[PDB]
Amino acid sequence: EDMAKIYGAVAAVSKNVNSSVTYEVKRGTHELIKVPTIPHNLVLIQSDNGK
Amino acid sequence: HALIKEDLGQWPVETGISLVNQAGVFAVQLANKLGIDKPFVLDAGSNYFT
């Protein structure tokens, strides 16, 4: 029974090793909006007689 | 066809960690299965017939 206690304690230490890590790479990334219409700024001004 | 098989059980083994440390845990369980964990003397002399 004492040996079973000792062996189990050593096994727990051996299981404390770390396998790897995982993370998400997202810094520097932004979302894009979509502009539907082209912003023209032209207006036509004409005289009443059409001259 | 006939075969003789010795059944000592199945013991899970984990990779990535020391096998010797795992074998220590299973050795005690195996000893209990065979009945040799505690001090003993065999008394099989009288198990016979003529």
Structure tokens at B29: 């369980």
Q: Which residue of B has its CA nearest to A12?
A: B21
From CA B50, how far away is CA B48, in angstroms rounded? 7
Structure tokens at A17: 């090793």
CA-CA-CA-CA torsion for B46, B48, B49, B50, nearest 10 degrees?
-100
From CA B5, how far away is CA B25, in angstroms rounded? 24
SS3 content of chain A, % helix, strand, coil (to 5): 25, 0, 75
From CA B20, how far away is CA A7, in angstroms rounded? 10
What are residue B12's phi and psi, to 5 degrees? -65, 140
Method for this entry: cryo-EM
Are B28 and B37 a contacting pair, CB within 8 Å? yes
Are B13 and B25 a contacting pair, CB within 8 Å? no
Residue from A5, A6, A10, A16 to probe the interface with B (highest B Cβ count within 10 Å): A10
In 3D space, the residue among B27, B28, B24 whose CA is nearest the CA of residue A14 turns out to be B24
